[PDB]
């Protein structure tokens, strides 16, 4: 219990051994030599590999240790949370970037730092591949199996070939005939009970779409509802009356629950809606308007089911309503998603780049689209159907970022372009010794490319061309070509790990409290 | 093995102990170079500029440190309790004025010690500027937000791009979108209930009709005004006899059932006035005769309870007028200018030296003089609109200062200018050599600018005294000037860490009780 | 004091020391001396020779090393699981094979630890002399008993005298009397009820008529087939008409109604055939048409459920038809013979190296061609009888290696002639020395008749390769020769333990999380 205050170079030796030790967790299990670690429960061990599910583990018995490793570790499962791969970047040229530990005396040589790396991330951004065909995205889904089986490099591309970003889901079965391809137009969002007596079925929550009347106090609503019966009384039987609101619902269940389960008692529906997004007010409104929910509300408890604004029951279009745990729809036909989608979609321009404010915001808003394909993936046993059930879910993500974040050429291609336009570099040879130490450790961001493949070689600056750039690709000592890491990876985690590095040596001291 | 005594060298390094580790806390979060603090929560930690919080977790587990840290973290919360601002300035100098580890006797040196320190109080409210525009207010919006989010920052220099101070509003938001401004009419000053039979309304206490009487008393009326039975007989059905009075509240307040409960059915009022302030006949002026609510009633037992004049129905003025908790008129017609003007004329004269002492009826100018500005912010969560929330509390306090008080000029130019002024204060051996030591100590007032541009580069002290440092300089290496602290900081800051530097050196053991 | 990093040399040497204790813990019942050990129990201490029970109770405290105990006694229950004994083989030489501490790396030594042991595992597949008949067998349980109870040895003697093949039942007795051996006609494979309102009886599942329409379909009839408008027709109230699939068991499952509530009075059935294989044209074949119970149904979605051609009462033949929870068919005319002779001869041909995927017909082959053996045992008490039940269980799985796969030649045997290989294929200095190292490191699959056979002299390695091995021959001080362990324990254990010299090598660290 005897946390309190550390001084200081104890605060110095406590993230010195934490992105050590963090940094030999997650340096181990990069490249070929793919160096395990096993992850326990408090039950029997997992053995795995990936970064997410060790930078998730990475506890420490100490409280002052898991304080200090809860804020190298937290971009890192944030950056893959955005995508999937990106783990081990961040949390490795988090370490690396940790030689400006002794430049914590900073603000001559930070605004530099982030004038340079500005620009490497333009540098990089310059220079991205971006696969939609599947000529080279071939050699992804041919190299990142080995071509194992060429139906599951031909199968996923050829889902991909017609339909736009489909939902790639996957089953297994004791059959192994031709697998199931299945375009099928349901749109996933969330919606459950607050309370059993509101949903009209029990068994698997289905409404029963007929006469359907929505209203919308759809914001983050504080202002308690219990007010919602006295047109709930003027539409008893003449609509299934649904309320529907953000995921900000306050505690007015007891106000429900015993006011309108009780006496004015409809078939009501009053609970949530996805996450605080502009398709969360979309999905309601593409399915409102057109397909009979309503129109759209902002924040505000304003009309209540004292009176509302539109008694809209009977424009149910050609669709199929269906409470859940989560509430969806079965087959529009009317052009919803043109209403709203269509301009995020002529907003995809950006693709080009695929700027990060976008990367959450354009493919949050938009991808509620069309088709989901439900497939089932097959062996000749259940063990060898688990085994392509893993690949497959291997090569599905790779497709995924192939289509949808663009694609650079990876392994240390990436940022040995970035350490010649560095050596070439930003033109001002820094007068100042701060600086022209900054850049001369900012071209030792040929680092990652070293403690990658100098494991069998090799990593000198002026030996770019002969074995980094021979044969002009991602070039290790095999085939010198055909391997391709994801954008997002070596570019957001390159900027997040730039905010870890600038964190963590301007860190001085440790505190605790209670709030 | 528990507390204890401490005598005295067991206590003279027990608050050498937390005089070291509370200095070295929050003398890093100073300045550009704000070198960070990691500070637990019950979760993940929170890691923190503002050195507000990391003295509010100076949390150790020893109780008697624990103790003695709750004293030196007292006047960082009182500086949050006035301004909000300068909590980093009082904890870094009064350890510098902390070596007084020796001369804590009373004559010599605390006589000039309190003495030099009222000259230099007096030489810096003499020496600062008049900090009143915007841009320089968004010159210390640097500072006291830690440019966290100007946007609050653009609010607020839109507020006072409007009509001067108006009545800055307390409300959060659970919302997404909409930052909203409003401006209605209110002039909002104390009055409320006795007893909620007394007053018409029982929601917002809304007077019924318009204009409707109030009684021509103000101030405390020492009849015991229980007489009420005349007074009464001019108004028995008419309109309220709205009582005002000042903290004069014996047990008549319990004999209002005199006219309550016993014969009179009118709507009897008696509650008291506003706070304690110079407006014994001018909280019934502003309301009153000027724009007709009331007389101009000095405070006196003329016109008893026995008989009035008249307060006949439509006794007031022809604009908004409603009790509440706190009165509320619209359509103020002049008289709320005139006393603005007069607090104006008065912050043109005695805003220089900031005396509190019968000026500040200037701060309710502006909810006296102006009307309202009501608001809200962009909250999608409960931390961060908290967090924007405190943030928005802050930086309306900078405009206070920036418009009630001022801005002082640069941060050590304050003391090295201070620093000319001890030269100009008597430089004698006085009747002890103690108090020559003690002026050659308190030159030491330029500890603030040493440690400050020590963190930049820099922090020639005693060659700065002459010229370089002046004026609004405190020369970086950038431009040498034109960066300006806020100024009641500076001030208050500075009184309330001398009687720190005076506390916990004098002190002299800790014992444990409970009362 | 708690669970931790631990990293990296300090997980060298705590999974250097759990490759030690139960190396020689597994390595101590090896041989004719059979060393024993104690393995502490709930009650008295259980006394074993039984390294299936050395596997599972090598259960330390410190969660460190049983957590990595857990991924080394994995393979050698899955070896347990598969065979029964080999146990030992395995543990021993993922112990043997974990001389690769230092060379985890990937391109030469594990390409040469992955095509060099694909060559020796090609070799031991063409070293495999067919231990098939009762003579051979009666070498095998020589040493498959492990000299417990040679009653049980009588038993499976009896069993594999008897009859070629039958299904081999599974059912205890701890009651006295009755070592039951006895054989029915009955033939065994899945289908079930979707619902029970499918299958003709609900209580036991018998068939109600003989010769009844049965109609046959294999794959997925993808068809809806709620479609039953006129395929029911064929007969509406005829007889239960029971169609057969796979398991594409979708949706209309609840479109039984069709028939079920709906108009249809009969019986209708639809559920799987058996899993996953490419034998579903045979699968149905054998049922059907051949045999005189349905269609022989191509694999396909074709004959869709609006109308078949015709369906008649007379559909099925003249033997024993019921629909079970798994479906009898008793009387087999020729059909299963004809399969059984196919299967015979393909189990003629790959059985030399005998891939079991590509075979695997076999699997229904013997419950199809031979009926049935249903046993039961001597419990003498309910303890020694799940004791002698488990050991009943193990010997008979042996009697499957001996039936289905073949026995190999000695124990030591196939690795003094599968390192002759390492000089009869590649021996040379290959283009690295770390793979000349790989091979004279994978001549040290020499040690496993090594340390078995000199442990009561002499373990002889280099002069016992060429001449003095041969053949059945782990040359004691006895007969030379007539020893020999089985074949899938001597391969397939090889393999799983090389995919923990693999990884258990290739691990370095041992973190923390729940989930």
């Given at each position: 219990t005897e946390i309190s205050f550390t001084n200081k170079n104890d605060t110095r030796e406590i993230v010195d051994e934490v992105v050590e030790n963090a940094f030999s967790s997650v340096c181990s299990?990069?490249?070929?030599?793919?160096?395990y670690v096993v992850i326990n429960q408090l039950n029997s061990p997992k053995v795995t590999k990936d970064g997410v599910s060790v930078a998730r583990a990475l506890d420490f018995n100490e409280a002052r240790r898991n304080m200090i490793a809860k804020i190298i570790t937290e971009p890192s499962i944030k950056t893959d949370a955005e995508v999937g791969d990106g783990t081990t970047t961040t949390v490795f040229i988090t370490y690396h970037l940790y030689q400006k530990f002794k430049d914590a005396m900073s603000f001559a040589n930070t605004r530099y730092l982030d004038t340079l790396i500005k620009q490497v991330l333009q540098y990089i951004g310059t220079l991205i591949q971006p696969g939609e065909i599947e000529s080279e995205m071939f050699r992804n889904m041919l190299l990142t199996s080995s071509n194992y089986e060429e139906e599951i490099v031909d199968k996923i591309l050829d889902i991909y070939r017609e339909h736009k970003n489909p939902n790639i889901h996957l089953e297994k079965s004791p059959m192994l005939p031709a697998d199931e391809v299945k375009m099928t137009k349901e749109i996933y969002f969330e919606g459950s009970f607050?309370?059993?007596?509101?949903?009209?079925?029990?068994?698997?929550?289905v409404v029963g779409p007929e006469k359907v009347g929505v209203v919308l106090i759809d914001g983050s609503i504080r202002a308690y509802p219990t007010q919602l019966i006295n047109a709930l009384l003027n539409r008893f039987i003449d609509n299934p009356v649904v309320l529907m609101a953000r995921n900000f619902e306050p505690e007015v269940i007891a106000a429900i629950n015993n006011e309108n389960q009780r006496l004015g008692t409809s078939r009501i529906f009053a609970y949530k809606v996805n996450a605080a997004g502009l398709l969360g007010a979309g999905t309601i409104d593409d399915l409102g308007r057109l397909l009979n929910i309503g129109p759209v509300f902002d924040v505000n408890s304003v009309d209540p089911a004292l009176v509302k604004y539109n008694d809209v029951t009977?424009?149910?279009?050609?669709k199929g309503i269906l409470l859940d745990k989560s509430i969806e729809e079965v087959e529009?036909?009317?052009d919803s998603i043109l209403e709203g989608l269509d301009n995020r979609y002529e907003a995809l321009g950006i693709i080009e780049r695929q700027t990060p404010i976008g990367r959450e915001l354009n493919r949050r808003i938009g991808r509620l689209r069309a088709n989901n394909v439900t497939i089932k993936v097959t062996g000749v046993t259940v063990s060898d159907a688990s085994e392509r059930w893993a690949r497959y879910e291997d090569v599905m993500k790779a497709a995924r970022t192939g289509q949808q974040f663009g694609v650079i050429p990876g392994i240390g291609y990436g940022y040995l372009m970035a350490s010649k336009w560095l050596e070439a570099n930003v033109p001002q040879q820094s007068d100042e010794k701060l600086e022209k130490c900054r850049i001369g450790l900012i071209e030792v961001l040929r680092a990652q490319y070293e403690h990658l493949t100098g494991h069998d070689g090799s990593a000198e600056n002026p030996i770019f061309i002969d074995l980094v750039t021979g044969q002009e690709s991602d070039t290790p000592m095999n085939v010198y070509d055909n391997a391709a890491a994801t954008m997002i990876a070596l570019e957001g985690a390159w900027q997040t790990a730039k905010t870890l590095g600038k964190i963590s040596n301007v860190m001085g001291r440790s505190n605790t409290n209670y709030a």
């Amino acid at each position: 219990t005897e946390i309190s205050f550390t001084n200081k170079n104890d605060t110095r030796e406590i993230v010195d051994e934490v992105v050590e030790n963090a940094f030999s967790s997650v340096c181990s299990t990069m490249g070929p030599n793919g160096n395990y670690v096993v992850i326990n429960q408090l039950n029997s061990p997992k053995v795995t590999k990936d970064g997410v599910s060790v930078a998730r583990a990475l506890d420490f018995n100490e409280a002052r240790r898991n304080m200090i490793a809860k804020i190298i570790t937290e971009p890192s499962i944030k950056t893959d949370a955005e995508v999937g791969d990106g783990t081990t970047t961040t949390v490795f040229i988090t370490y690396h970037l940790y030689q400006k530990f002794k430049d914590a005396m900073s603000f001559a040589n930070t605004r530099y730092l982030d004038t340079l790396i500005k620009q490497v991330l333009q540098y990089i951004g310059t220079l991205i591949q971006p696969g939609e065909i599947e000529s080279e995205m071939f050699r992804n889904m041919l190299l990142t199996s080995s071509n194992y089986e060429e139906e599951i490099v031909d199968k996923i591309l050829d889902i991909y070939r017609e339909h736009k970003n489909p939902n790639i889901h996957l089953e297994k079965s004791p059959m192994l005939p031709a697998d199931e391809v299945k375009m099928t137009k349901e749109i996933y969002f969330e919606g459950s009970f607050p309370i059993e007596t509101q949903v009209p079925a029990n068994g698997a929550y289905v409404v029963g779409p007929e006469k359907v009347g929505v209203v919308l106090i759809d914001g983050s609503i504080r202002a308690y509802p219990t007010q919602l019966i006295n047109a709930l009384l003027n539409r008893f039987i003449d609509n299934p009356v649904v309320l529907m609101a953000r995921n900000f619902e306050p505690e007015v269940i007891a106000a429900i629950n015993n006011e309108n389960q009780r006496l004015g008692t409809s078939r009501i529906f009053a609970y949530k809606v996805n996450a605080a997004g502009l398709l969360g007010a979309g999905t309601i409104d593409d399915l409102g308007r057109l397909l009979n929910i309503g129109p759209v509300f902002d924040v505000n408890s304003v009309d209540p089911a004292l009176v509302k604004y539109n008694d809209v029951t009977l424009w149910l279009g050609r669709k199929g309503i269906l409470l859940d745990k989560s509430i969806e729809e079965v087959e529009s036909r009317a052009d919803s998603i043109l209403e709203g989608l269509d301009n995020r979609y002529e907003a995809l321009g950006i693709i080009e780049r695929q700027t990060p404010i976008g990367r959450e915001l354009n493919r949050r808003i938009g991808r509620l689209r069309a088709n989901n394909v439900t497939i089932k993936v097959t062996g000749v046993t259940v063990s060898d159907a688990s085994e392509r059930w893993a690949r497959y879910e291997d090569v599905m993500k790779a497709a995924r970022t192939g289509q949808q974040f663009g694609v650079i050429p990876g392994i240390g291609y990436g940022y040995l372009m970035a350490s010649k336009w560095l050596e070439a570099n930003v033109p001002q040879q820094s007068d100042e010794k701060l600086e022209k130490c900054r850049i001369g450790l900012i071209e030792v961001l040929r680092a990652q490319y070293e403690h990658l493949t100098g494991h069998d070689g090799s990593a000198e600056n002026p030996i770019f061309i002969d074995l980094v750039t021979g044969q002009e690709s991602d070039t290790p000592m095999n085939v010198y070509d055909n391997a391709a890491a994801t954008m997002i990876a070596l570019e957001g985690a390159w900027q997040t790990a730039k905010t870890l590095g600038k964190i963590s040596n301007v860190m001085g001291r440790s505190n605790t409290n209670y709030a």
